[PDB]
Amino acid sequence: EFVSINVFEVYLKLVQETIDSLISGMKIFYVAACCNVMSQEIVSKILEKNKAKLLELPLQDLMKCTYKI
Amino acid sequence: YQTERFTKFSDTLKEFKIEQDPFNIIREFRSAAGQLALDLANSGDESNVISSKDWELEARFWHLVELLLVFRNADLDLDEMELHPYNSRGLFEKKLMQDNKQLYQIWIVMVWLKENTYVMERPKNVPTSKWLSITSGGLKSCDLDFPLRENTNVLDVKDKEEDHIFFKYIYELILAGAIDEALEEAKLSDNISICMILCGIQEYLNPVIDTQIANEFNTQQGIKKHSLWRRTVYSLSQQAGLDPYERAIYSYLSGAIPNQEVLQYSDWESDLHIHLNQILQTEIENYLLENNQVGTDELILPLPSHALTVQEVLNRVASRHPSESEHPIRVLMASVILDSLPSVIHSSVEMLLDIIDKPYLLRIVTHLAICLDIINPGSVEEVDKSKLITTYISLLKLQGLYENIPIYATFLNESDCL
Amino acid sequence: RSKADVERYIASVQGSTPSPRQKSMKGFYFAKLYYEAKEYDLAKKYICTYINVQERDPKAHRFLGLLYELEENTDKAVECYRRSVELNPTQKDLVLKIAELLCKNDVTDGRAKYWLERAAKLFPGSPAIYKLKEQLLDCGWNKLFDLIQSELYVRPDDVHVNIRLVEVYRSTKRLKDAVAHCHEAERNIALRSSLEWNSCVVQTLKEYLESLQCLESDKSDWRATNTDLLLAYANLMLLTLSTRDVQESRELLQSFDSALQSVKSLGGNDELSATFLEMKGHFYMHAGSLLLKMGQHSSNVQWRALSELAALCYLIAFQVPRPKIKLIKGEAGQNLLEMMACDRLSQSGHMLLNLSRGKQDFLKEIVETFANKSGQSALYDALFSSQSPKDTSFLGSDDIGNIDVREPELEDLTRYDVGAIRAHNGSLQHLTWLGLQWNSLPALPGIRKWLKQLFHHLPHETSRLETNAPESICILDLEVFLLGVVYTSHLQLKEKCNSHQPLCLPLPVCKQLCTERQKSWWDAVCTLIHRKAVPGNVAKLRLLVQHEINTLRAQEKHGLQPALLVHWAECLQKTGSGLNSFYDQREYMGRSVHYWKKVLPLLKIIKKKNSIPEPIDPLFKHFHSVDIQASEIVEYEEDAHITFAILDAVNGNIEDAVTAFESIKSVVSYWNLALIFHRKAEDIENDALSPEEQEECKNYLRKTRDYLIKIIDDSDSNLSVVKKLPVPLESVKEMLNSVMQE
Amino acid sequence: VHYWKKVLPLLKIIKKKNSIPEPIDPLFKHFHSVDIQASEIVEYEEDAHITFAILDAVNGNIEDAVTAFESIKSVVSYWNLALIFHRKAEDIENDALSPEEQEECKNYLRKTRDYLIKIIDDSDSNLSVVKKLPVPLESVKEMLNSVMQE
């Protein structure tokens, strides 16, 4: 065919990272589906992790964040 | 005579290749087109008014090109600004415009946009004094906000009609960058309070604190609680029972998009200008928030925080003005703005393989390509230069101006074949 | 520094900024010194913490990627570069790196392909781009061949790629195809100039000679391939002498001499025999150049003896006759062979002269003393180690018979140079050398003819002179350019030896004589004109040229010393004043007046002993060695006023031109006064017209006669005036003969 | 000239399309109806330069006044050029004095005649010029009658 945020997210999923994150957050702000997407991103980040850069990336969901900290 | 044209452009190239800075070429191209714009315009067949506008447009294009390539290319990198938190917002704004070239470019473009904006002639027979409603009796207060406090029925018809003349004129002046003239008009036409409103445009500086501008200023100036000012103005802009041009003004000042009644008459340039203004305003205020130079008290109201990209503004304004958008030199205008310029050169090159139908185009692209490779050796693909000059030369032949073909030859060994 | 210096600074800023955020924001500047103290497990954690607070810095992210590169952790290093690249797109070199690393580690994923595509569009057809294309393929023989061929289609001048084609041919042991392409490629002017290519050419040929396939196939084309080896040797020798060191150059000579000895036995009357002839000359010429290289570093006694020896070598070369061009199969081949001949005579020629100017008839002694066969053994001795067999060495067996011992004539030398401009692909090195070699001679080189031989149909002056766009480049611009390059080069070398002959250096031995800036420009405008640029690099090349145009035309902020402008002005006046046609006269005189008009304001300030505003990063280095003095100002003002008058005359303002010419009693003003008085007479001299007018017409022809006689009278008396003549003396006399017979 | 000298700094800022610092409770109300535009700036600079020259002439700097007047081909500059050329002639016209000087004196009266004629020629042709006359048309003709009878 070639919204942009979603495309960035999809590209990340198939796979700069910070920009994609900001895009996804903005999309979430723009409700249930957005929360689901946010949770998916969190799970993906957790999988990638498995120091300062990591902290920068980080900056029920609340409980998870607390457990992480 | 006018079928001289090519000479002028050719002439400029002669002078350049011969004093062996290249930005002068383009400057001359501009002036050349402008001169021609005048010719076809003055006394002419009404078949000429069209190609006259295509020359004025030509000229604006060369100007935009000069401005942007001068800034981009004559970039020799100066000294970084070191601010402190005690520094005024004014300095932070300046820093922003220094450090972020992407955004300064937006400024450059807006400046160009203003440069070429039409403004009506100064209203004649303007009255001695404001709302002179007073004479009918019934203004219990002589302040701009009185008929807002209670029904607009207070103001005489003629007074409203004049306020309309004023606010429209001020608005045109603002879109043209004529801020000084707007303040002069406000002062002199007994619109002191509106004048005062126009003074809020400046961010705060204090030469004493903001040392690094103790040259430009001898006295503090500008207004400290600007985020407030800005919401105050924007809210004022949304309050109806004001003249549509007044609301339009406040819209522009708040970094917003003016009401429909006014915006409906804005063209590609005007509209694009409006939206770059929006990008700009939003970006500054965000820059200030990221540096804690905004105070929470001032966030009275929600203004949008998400800046568009110049790409997207262009796409939207385009879809809002398709006819104008599609005009072939204004496509180049956009191409220059986005830097996708050799991109479009190679493109219109392949359109020679409904570019032949319009005469200016094949010329312009060629001379632009020449300028580009002069200023930035490598810029346009060797082949594309060959193809372009080839075709334009064959038109120099069709015009019977073989005389000045060698000048254009000075860019290939392919020239051998002439 | 040490471990203590860096770990003690921990307590330095720890005591200045103790909060965690500022403690971590100093991590990059902490890590800055551990990378220097060879601590990579430590530096890694320091930068990684600064990245924990400053996660958007492209510099820090790249620095960690460069540190993970030293750790050889590809997956970690790549990711770091990615972050710096996505933050800042202007980091082109990182897009290459990512593409470079993705193809080296694993190609299975298309991500490596993607990043290679971007790397290509950021560096159009760079040498690394193909390297990565071959790497990605590596992870079958027919497959590689198709890449090279498809790559050679659009990049036939790439040295590395063509080399790979020979290597692929050689890997399949189809050497006949290897030499076949090697032969068809020796016609390429660019490849012929490539040191590494010629080295490959020498090997692939020798391999074929010894190859079983060469004998079985036939003995008919054996001679054809053999010719290319000698040609390759000559080119390879020219290049090795310049770049490589003393040892390597000498070694190449032995291979050359072995080939010559192995070839002479066959003889005959075909291309191979003709090639042997010309290559024979090259051998001595290069051998002479090789000799002079050793002596330069050595003592004085060896220098004279070696230069004596070299003088003989160059002499031998110059004597060798022009090769039989008609005798070659094709037009390309024969033109090439002649081109090299001109190069031989030109290079050896100037050397022969510069060595003979040292003393009176120095050449005669060289022949009378070393033409003896004793010299042949003294030459073999100095060049080679005597241990090698002196029988199969061509040097020891050549019949040195009747050395002409005649110094070269300038007129012959000029046509040798002009014909050899394309010898070394017109490298500004080549021309700046020639221009300098003529800097010591009384006759000047036909630069305008050199440029016509290089950039054909490039107009003398471009109509669109108003702009500096490089589509308006003109042979004048180039002519004006080379003049400065040589005027600049001479002064730079003059300064060098003063701190420590400059003419005596041969072309290969000497180093770059121009500034890399100047060389970059010439290479750019050359690639642009000849249409061997790159679509991607077109815009860059184009701008690189554009940058300097405003200086070659003395426009805004020209980096031109007043002396160089004056030199340009007069050098163009006298260049133009000797031309026959009006078009060329007008142009060269116009430019000359232009530069004059730019200098006179400077001279006036200099006339009152003030200071000139020095330049900012000038294109042509300033020098106080040639700074204009008041002693010479009035002369330039006068010489300029002539140039003004000349242009006035060419335009039609005869009244003002004569009024000016007559004001100054100069030899040149006579030739102008005479030339314009003759024209007013000749046209009106024979048509039916008023008798009174006819008498006035004859009266002008009488003035012409008188001025030409004043020229010859003053010319024969004094030599300094002979050099001031705007045209040759014999040309002045030639007109006079016709003037009086009229 | 005084008021002119105060405006020109403002006009120069206005000439580059900048903003004028508006006043504080002005005595004469400002109006954007008559705010100066760039279209009229060069005219005022010219019309002012005339006013400068006129005062220079009245003070005695005739050389600079004429040099300025002649620079601009305006109807008013003619009446000034003429009026000052006539005075240099009339005083020197009849006293005993060097004959060569007398010829130079007459030469000025010849210039006076020419400039007055240029006024009337351009005046009768166009009405806009009639309004630019610094004095009445009949007054210009009145002088000319006396100028030529001299």
Side-chain angles (χ1 to χ4, degrees), chain A residues 25 32-33 52 58, chain B, chain C, chain D:
Chain B
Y1 94 97
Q2 192 197 139
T3 313
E4 213 75 53
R5 56 201 78 186
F6 324 89
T7 326
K8 296 217 168 177
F9 293 84
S10 80
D11 232 325
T12 306
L13 298 160
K14 284 177 193 212
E15 292 160 334
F16 180 80
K17 198 221 71 159
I18 318 289
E19 200 208 314
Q20 39 60 220
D21 179 43
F23 290 126
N24 285 292
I25 298 178
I26 308 159
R27 230 162 271 139
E28 272 205 293
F29 285 164
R30 183 201 181 180
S31 201
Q35 189 52 59
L36 296 162
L38 300 173
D39 296 28
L40 288 150
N42 264 318
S43 49
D45 220 55
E46 296 183 65
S47 74
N48 302 141
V49 174
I50 301 302
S51 51
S52 162
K53 305 166 203 160
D54 285 324
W55 277 113
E56 291 157 342
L57 265 166
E58 245 251 44
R60 297 169 186 182
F61 171 70
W62 295 118
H63 193 205
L64 211 196
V65 166
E66 173 202 20
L67 295 173
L68 280 175
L69 288 176
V70 164
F71 168 78
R72 290 179 198 169
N73 225 121
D75 228 284
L76 289 191
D77 316 294
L78 306 173
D79 265 305
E80 183 90 89
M81 194 148 84
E82 282 158 354
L83 300 193
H84 299 287
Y86 66 68
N87 281 134
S88 311
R89 284 193 176 211
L91 269 189
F92 283 84
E93 198 177 34
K94 299 215 168 189
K95 175 142 161 125
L96 176 63
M97 312 306 283
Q98 271 196 17
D99 293 1
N100 177 339
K101 300 193 211 166
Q102 265 279 26
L103 191 169
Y104 193 68
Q105 242 148 119
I106 289 191
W107 181 246
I108 296 279
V109 167
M110 290 175 60
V111 166
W112 167 79
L113 273 164
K114 291 172 193 152
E115 193 114 26
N116 309 313
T117 292
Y118 173 90
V119 180
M120 63 193 273
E121 75 183 19
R122 206 176 309 87
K124 309 186 193 160
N125 268 296
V126 154
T128 34
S129 59
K130 171 112 200 190
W131 289 350
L132 183 61
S133 302
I134 307 267
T135 292
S136 299
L139 275 181
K140 307 204 180 206
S141 189
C142 296
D143 75 279
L144 300 191
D145 281 343
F146 177 74
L148 304 184
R149 256 177 282 145
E150 47 216 298
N151 60 78
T152 332
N153 217 60
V154 153
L155 283 189
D156 189 297
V157 183
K158 298 162 178 212
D159 281 333
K160 294 173 160 192
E161 292 171 334
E162 265 148 4
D163 275 27
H164 180 76
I165 308 321
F166 174 73
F167 286 122
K168 175 155 164 202
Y169 182 43
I170 294 285
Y171 181 71
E172 302 191 355
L173 287 172
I174 281 180
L175 291 176
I179 303 295
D180 286 317
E181 292 80 350
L183 301 155
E184 198 185 36
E185 255 285 315
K187 291 193 217 86
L188 297 193
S189 74
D190 195 10
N191 273 291
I192 285 77
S193 292
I194 293 296
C195 190
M196 292 193 291
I197 301 185
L198 302 178
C199 294
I201 289 165
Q202 280 99 81
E203 220 78 60
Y204 181 74
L205 288 152
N206 183 319
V208 183
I209 302 189
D210 308 315
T211 273
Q212 42 276 74
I213 51 73
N215 231 320
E216 299 162 35
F217 294 95
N218 33 38
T219 290
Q220 80 282 344
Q221 194 188 60
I223 87 80
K224 299 183 192 175
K225 281 187 184 73
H226 211 276
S227 286
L228 172 64
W229 179 75
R230 189 192 181 204
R231 279 85 188 163
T232 314
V233 169
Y234 173 81
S235 167
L236 181 52
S237 92
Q238 289 293 297
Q239 273 172 56
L242 295 198
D243 188 279
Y245 284 101
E246 177 174 15
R247 305 204 309 277
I249 289 160
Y250 305 143
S251 285
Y252 189 91
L253 301 188
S254 335
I257 296 185
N259 69 83
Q260 233 303 102
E261 197 161 3
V262 170
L263 199 64
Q264 92 201 91
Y265 299 137
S266 48
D267 57 285
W268 194 80
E269 290 95 40
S270 246
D271 187 331
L272 168 59
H273 175 200
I274 302 287
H275 286 61
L276 291 177
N277 182 55
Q278 175 163 68
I279 296 200
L280 183 53
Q281 202 99 332
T282 299
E283 284 292 359
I284 283 102
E285 182 146 284
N286 280 299
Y287 185 65
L288 297 178
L289 295 160
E290 288 157 43
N291 285 286
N292 320 282
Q293 290 287 329
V294 176
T296 178
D297 299 310
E298 294 180 52
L299 303 188
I300 307 321
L301 294 167
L303 293 177
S305 62
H306 170 81
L308 287 193
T309 74
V310 162
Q311 172 72 76
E312 258 280 308
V313 167
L314 279 169
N315 281 340
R316 294 186 183 173
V317 178
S319 75
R320 203 167 323 124
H321 298 264
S323 38
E324 311 187 49
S325 319
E326 290 161 18
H327 190 301
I329 103 295
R330 254 193 284 267
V331 180
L332 293 163
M333 285 180 172
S335 305
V336 160
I337 282 163
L338 304 156
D339 222 332
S340 71
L341 194 52
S343 330
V344 182
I345 300 277
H346 192 301
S347 179
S348 44
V349 155
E350 309 206 22
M351 256 234 155
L352 303 144
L353 200 39
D354 305 334
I355 171 169
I356 309 192
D357 295 333
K358 337 227 175 152
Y360 49 78
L361 192 46
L362 175 51
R363 189 219 305 111
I364 297 166
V365 185
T366 307
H367 290 81
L368 179 60
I370 301 278
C371 270
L372 276 151
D373 269 299
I374 289 165
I375 297 167
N376 278 322
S379 256
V380 198
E381 191 182 331
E382 257 185 301
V383 188
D384 282 324
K385 309 176 236 133
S386 311
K387 279 186 161 182
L388 277 171
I389 307 167
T390 307
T391 314
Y392 181 66
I393 280 182
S394 69
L395 295 192
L396 299 175
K397 297 172 170 188
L398 219 201
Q399 283 286 292
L401 285 175
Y402 307 102
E403 302 180 325
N404 288 347
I405 302 194
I407 303 58
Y408 295 81
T410 314
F411 304 95
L412 306 162
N413 212 50
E414 285 308 272
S415 187
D416 272 292
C417 309
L418 299 156
Chain C
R1 273 173 286 94
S2 62
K3 293 179 179 179
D5 283 7
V6 194
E7 76 186 341
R8 193 196 68 260
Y9 291 147
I10 298 176
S12 62
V13 180
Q14 174 63 49
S16 302
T17 56
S19 76
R21 315 293 178 82
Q22 185 63 261
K23 219 198 306 186
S24 294
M25 188 164 292
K26 298 293 182 183
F28 178 31
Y29 305 92
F30 290 174
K32 251 176 176 180
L33 273 61
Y34 302 103
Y35 151 87
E36 301 166 344
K38 319 304 174 184
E39 302 288 4
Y40 299 103
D41 175 69
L42 310 182
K44 180 178 71 172
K45 298 217 166 56
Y46 281 101
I47 183 61
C48 186
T49 52
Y50 173 94
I51 294 169
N52 201 7
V53 304
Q54 285 279 72
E55 58 187 354
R56 288 174 49 83
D57 184 6
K59 168 52 165 154
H61 271 289
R62 187 196 165 166
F63 181 77
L64 177 56
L66 187 147
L67 224 65
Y68 269 129
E69 184 176 358
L70 291 174
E71 190 168 12
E72 310 196 25
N73 205 328
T74 301
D75 302 358
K76 304 290 181 177
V78 160
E79 180 62 12
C80 287
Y81 294 136
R82 293 202 61 182
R83 185 53 181 174
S84 182
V85 166
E86 60 183 332
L87 294 171
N88 181 14
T90 59
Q91 293 177 109
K92 309 176 194 172
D93 46 356
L94 295 183
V95 184
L96 170 76
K97 200 70 171 183
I98 295 167
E100 180 183 2
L101 304 179
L102 281 180
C103 294
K104 188 176 182 178
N105 190 33
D106 184 8
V107 169
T108 58
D109 268 357
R111 190 180 301 162
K113 159 187 161 202
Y114 161 89
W115 277 91
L116 181 58
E117 293 181 3
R118 286 187 60 198
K121 312 203 184 231
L122 288 171
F123 308 94
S126 92
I129 293 304
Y130 171 74
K131 181 205 174 199
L132 304 178
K133 252 170 167 282
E134 173 167 330
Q135 281 211 19
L136 190 151
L137 180 64
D138 183 7
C139 296
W141 274 127
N142 182 17
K143 199 181 191 74
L144 182 67
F145 174 77
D146 294 353
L147 160 58
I148 301 170
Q149 198 153 42
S150 62
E151 185 70 353
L152 188 160
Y153 186 72
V154 295
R155 292 173 66 186
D157 283 5
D158 190 335
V159 179
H160 186 274
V161 179
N162 288 285
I163 285 167
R164 199 72 208 164
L165 179 54
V166 179
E167 295 182 13
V168 169
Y169 279 133
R170 180 194 298 178
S171 299
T172 49
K173 285 180 181 192
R174 51 175 157 187
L175 285 169
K176 179 205 152 191
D177 292 1
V179 176
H181 175 277
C182 201
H183 165 62
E184 88 192 359
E186 284 286 315
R187 183 166 44 88
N188 184 293
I189 62 176
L191 297 174
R192 184 172 51 84
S193 179
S194 165
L195 175 69
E196 301 182 20
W197 164 259
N198 283 320
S199 182
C200 176
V201 169
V202 168
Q203 297 177 332
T204 183
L205 294 167
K206 276 180 181 296
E207 297 294 333
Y208 185 67
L209 291 172
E210 297 158 6
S211 71
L212 186 148
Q213 287 144 338
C214 166
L215 178 77
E216 65 186 10
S217 180
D218 64 8
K219 304 293 291 182
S220 61
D221 299 0
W222 183 86
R223 295 177 62 88
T225 60
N226 195 330
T227 66
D228 292 351
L229 175 59
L230 297 165
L231 290 173
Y233 272 139
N235 303 124
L236 187 69
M237 188 60 185
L238 181 81
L239 305 166
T240 306
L241 279 164
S242 58
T243 66
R244 266 43 178 167
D245 54 357
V246 297
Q247 298 286 115
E248 191 156 353
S249 52
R250 182 184 60 161
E251 295 180 25
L252 180 46
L253 182 63
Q254 204 163 350
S255 302
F256 205 122
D257 183 67
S258 176
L260 281 177
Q261 187 69 54
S262 180
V263 164
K264 76 197 295 180
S265 57
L266 277 65
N269 193 21
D270 61 2
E271 174 172 33
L272 172 61
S273 186
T275 305
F276 166 81
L277 180 62
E278 185 55 40
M279 299 300 97
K280 190 213 253 191
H282 278 70
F283 172 79
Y284 284 97
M285 180 180 66
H286 298 328
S289 300
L290 189 152
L291 278 169
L292 274 171
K293 188 169 191 174
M294 313 186 305
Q296 172 187 13
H297 302 104
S298 174
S299 63
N300 301 277
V301 176
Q302 297 212 352
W303 189 323
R304 69 223 306 172
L306 287 172
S307 63
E308 287 175 359
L309 201 61
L312 179 61
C313 291
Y314 291 142
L315 196 58
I316 295 164
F318 196 107
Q319 178 191 330
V320 182
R322 183 182 309 271
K324 310 243 177 182
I325 296 301
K326 308 221 208 179
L327 289 181
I328 318 303
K329 176 185 178 183
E331 301 178 2
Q334 67 193 29
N335 187 344
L336 166 69
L337 185 62
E338 190 179 4
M339 196 194 306
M340 302 179 67
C342 300
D343 182 12
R344 182 200 59 194
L345 297 173
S346 44
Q347 188 173 182
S348 61
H350 294 90
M351 296 306 303
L352 282 161
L353 294 174
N354 289 279
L355 301 176
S356 70
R357 303 198 86 80
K359 336 184 181 177
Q360 182 180 343
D361 64 79
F362 168 81
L363 188 59
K364 175 61 186 304
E365 285 185 8
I366 300 298
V367 188
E368 187 173 342
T369 184
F370 290 174
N372 187 336
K373 188 181 185 300
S374 175
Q376 292 190 230
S377 63
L379 177 60
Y380 203 84
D381 183 24
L383 287 178
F384 304 81
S385 57
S386 61
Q387 297 300 133
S388 55
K390 203 190 181 181
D391 194 78
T392 59
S393 60
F394 164 84
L395 170 54
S397 59
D398 186 60
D399 299 357
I400 296 172
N402 195 33
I403 304 300
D404 298 2
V405 65
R406 298 187 299 177
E407 273 190 21
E409 271 176 3
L410 295 170
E411 292 181 353
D412 289 337
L413 203 62
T414 48
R415 179 175 58 101
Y416 298 150
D417 291 331
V418 177
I421 284 286
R422 306 219 60 178
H424 302 157
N425 286 327
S427 72
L428 195 78
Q429 183 63 33
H430 187 113
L431 312 192
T432 305
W433 190 82
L434 302 178
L436 281 157
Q437 297 294 334
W438 290 96
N439 215 33
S440 62
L441 295 172
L444 310 182
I447 292 180
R448 64 183 183 88
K449 294 194 208 70
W450 291 352
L451 310 178
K452 208 80 182 188
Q453 195 63 16
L454 285 170
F455 320 98
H456 288 292
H457 297 297
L458 186 61
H460 280 281
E461 181 68 83
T462 298
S463 54
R464 299 181 178 174
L465 202 70
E466 70 287 357
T467 61
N468 56 312
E471 303 178 354
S472 74
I473 189 66
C474 63
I475 282 172
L476 266 169
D477 288 328
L478 300 170
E479 194 174 357
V480 175
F481 171 69
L482 295 174
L483 287 167
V485 167
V486 170
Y487 186 55
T488 297
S489 185
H490 191 75
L491 279 175
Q492 188 60 54
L493 297 174
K494 172 188 292 175
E495 177 179 48
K496 182 184 164 107
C497 190
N498 188 333
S499 177
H500 181 78
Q501 188 171 336
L503 324 172
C504 295
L505 293 175
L507 175 59
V509 173
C510 57
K511 63 181 180 180
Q512 276 191 338
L513 297 181
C514 53
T515 80
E516 190 65 16
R517 184 179 179 184
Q518 295 154 13
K519 180 58 173 172
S520 294
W521 188 87
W522 186 264
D523 290 336
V525 62
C526 285
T527 54
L528 285 162
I529 293 285
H530 300 134
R531 181 193 295 280
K532 275 183 169 162
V534 176
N537 229 27
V538 169
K540 174 52 188 160
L541 297 169
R542 203 179 151 286
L543 179 62
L544 181 62
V545 179
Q546 183 176 332
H547 259 302
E548 310 304 339
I549 297 293
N550 277 341
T551 299
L552 299 183
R553 304 183 176 175
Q555 295 298 355
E556 293 177 350
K557 281 186 169 57
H558 57 69
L560 296 178
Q561 191 178 355
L564 168 57
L565 268 175
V566 175
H567 175 271
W568 278 354
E570 293 200 3
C571 186
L572 281 178
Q573 170 209 330
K574 298 166 186 190
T575 296
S577 184
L579 300 176
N580 61 334
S581 64
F582 277 85
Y583 274 87
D584 302 340
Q585 274 192 34
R586 182 181 302 266
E587 290 168 349
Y588 287 70
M589 289 304 310
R591 282 290 200 94
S592 182
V593 169
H594 172 53
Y595 300 121
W596 274 123
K597 264 175 175 181
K598 284 301 189 188
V599 178
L600 305 182
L602 306 182
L603 300 177
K604 298 280 188 179
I605 300 300
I606 295 167
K607 200 182 193 300
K608 288 190 296 182
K609 188 179 178 181
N610 288 346
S611 59
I612 57 170
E614 279 188 354
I616 299 172
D617 186 1
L619 173 62
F620 291 107
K621 296 177 177 178
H622 269 48
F623 289 82
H624 300 70
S625 306
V626 295
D627 220 359
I628 302 184
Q629 295 176 334
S631 299
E632 318 171 289
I633 290 293
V634 185
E635 163 177 0
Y636 295 137
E637 299 179 336
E638 227 165 59
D639 207 325
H641 213 65
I642 294 169
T643 313
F644 295 156
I646 293 171
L647 184 54
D648 284 4
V650 173
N651 275 15
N653 294 110
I654 299 173
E655 172 174 332
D656 279 306
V658 172
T659 299
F661 277 114
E662 282 179 349
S663 176
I664 53 183
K665 303 179 176 297
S666 61
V667 183
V668 60
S669 67
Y670 298 159
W671 177 250
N672 268 275
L673 287 164
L675 182 62
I676 68 181
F677 279 131
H678 173 237
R679 290 202 254 88
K680 298 184 83 179
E682 183 178 1
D683 184 6
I684 299 181
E685 179 63 12
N686 239 24
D687 291 343
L689 65 80
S690 58
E692 170 280 345
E693 184 68 13
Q694 181 159 22
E695 202 290 329
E696 182 66 6
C697 174
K698 294 181 171 180
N699 185 25
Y700 282 171
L701 182 55
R702 299 190 50 196
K703 236 148 183 169
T704 295
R705 182 199 65 204
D706 293 358
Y707 277 101
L708 268 50
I709 292 166
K710 279 183 203 185
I711 285 168
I712 298 165
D713 280 4
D714 304 0
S715 168
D716 288 326
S717 176
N718 186 231
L719 172 61
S720 77
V721 162
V722 173
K723 299 171 185 178
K724 276 191 165 196
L725 296 172
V727 305
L729 178 60
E730 184 177 1
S731 183
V732 176
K733 293 197 188 180
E734 185 60 18
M735 170 177 279
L736 189 50
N737 286 6
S738 177
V739 163
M740 302 179 75
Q741 294 181 32
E742 280 182 13
Chain D
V1 169
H2 172 53
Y3 300 121
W4 274 123
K5 264 175 175 181
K6 284 301 189 188
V7 178
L8 305 182
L10 306 182
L11 300 177
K12 298 280 188 178
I13 300 300
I14 295 168
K15 199 182 193 300
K16 288 190 296 182
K17 188 179 178 181
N18 288 346
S19 59
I20 57 170
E22 279 188 354
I24 299 172
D25 186 1
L27 173 62
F28 292 107
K29 296 177 177 178
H30 269 48
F31 289 83
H32 300 70
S33 306
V34 295
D35 220 359
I36 302 184
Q37 295 176 334
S39 299
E40 318 171 289
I41 290 293
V42 185
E43 163 177 0
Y44 295 137
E45 299 179 336
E46 227 165 59
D47 207 325
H49 213 65
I50 294 169
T51 313
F52 295 156
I54 293 171
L55 184 54
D56 284 4
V58 174
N59 275 15
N61 294 110
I62 299 173
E63 172 174 332
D64 279 306
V66 172
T67 299
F69 277 114
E70 282 179 349
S71 176
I72 53 183
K73 303 179 176 297
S74 61
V75 183
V76 60
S77 67
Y78 298 159
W79 177 250
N80 268 275
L81 287 164
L83 182 62
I84 68 181
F85 279 131
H86 173 237
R87 290 202 254 88
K88 298 184 83 179
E90 183 178 1
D91 184 6
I92 299 181
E93 179 63 12
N94 239 24
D95 291 343
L97 65 80
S98 58
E100 170 280 345
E101 184 68 13
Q102 181 159 22
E103 202 290 329
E104 182 66 6
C105 174
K106 294 181 171 180
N107 184 25
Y108 282 171
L109 182 55
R110 299 189 50 196
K111 236 148 183 169
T112 295
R113 182 199 65 204
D114 293 358
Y115 277 101
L116 268 50
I117 292 166
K118 279 183 203 185
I119 285 168
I120 298 165
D121 280 4
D122 304 0
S123 168
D124 288 326
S125 176
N126 186 231
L127 172 61
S128 77
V129 162
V130 173
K131 299 171 185 178
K132 276 191 165 196
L133 296 172
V135 305
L137 178 60
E138 184 177 1
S139 183
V140 176
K141 293 197 188 180
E142 185 60 19
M143 170 177 279
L144 189 50
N145 286 6
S146 177
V147 163
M148 303 179 75
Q149 294 181 32
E150 280 182 13

